[PDB]
Amino acid sequence: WTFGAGAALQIPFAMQMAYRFNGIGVTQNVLYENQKLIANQFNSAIGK
């Protein structure tokens, strides 16, 4: 979202997701513990 609010900033994509889970009241540790699993669901979802 930084590019929207000001100067575009570099950020690993996994880092973005961590914030987003934190945005919905989910501890970011969950993501990293399931990064691979989450990706496949996302990858499968876009195909469906």
Binding site: P12, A14, Y32, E33, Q35, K36
Partner: peptide, 22 residues
């Protein structure tokens, strides 16, 4: 974790414990 990196997390309680030990 993927991409985790090595480092040491300092403990604020340790110095007090060490001084208390002394």
């Amino acid at each position: 974790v993927i991409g985790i990196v090595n480092n040491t997390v300092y403990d604020p309680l340790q110095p007090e414990l060490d001084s208390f030990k002394e």
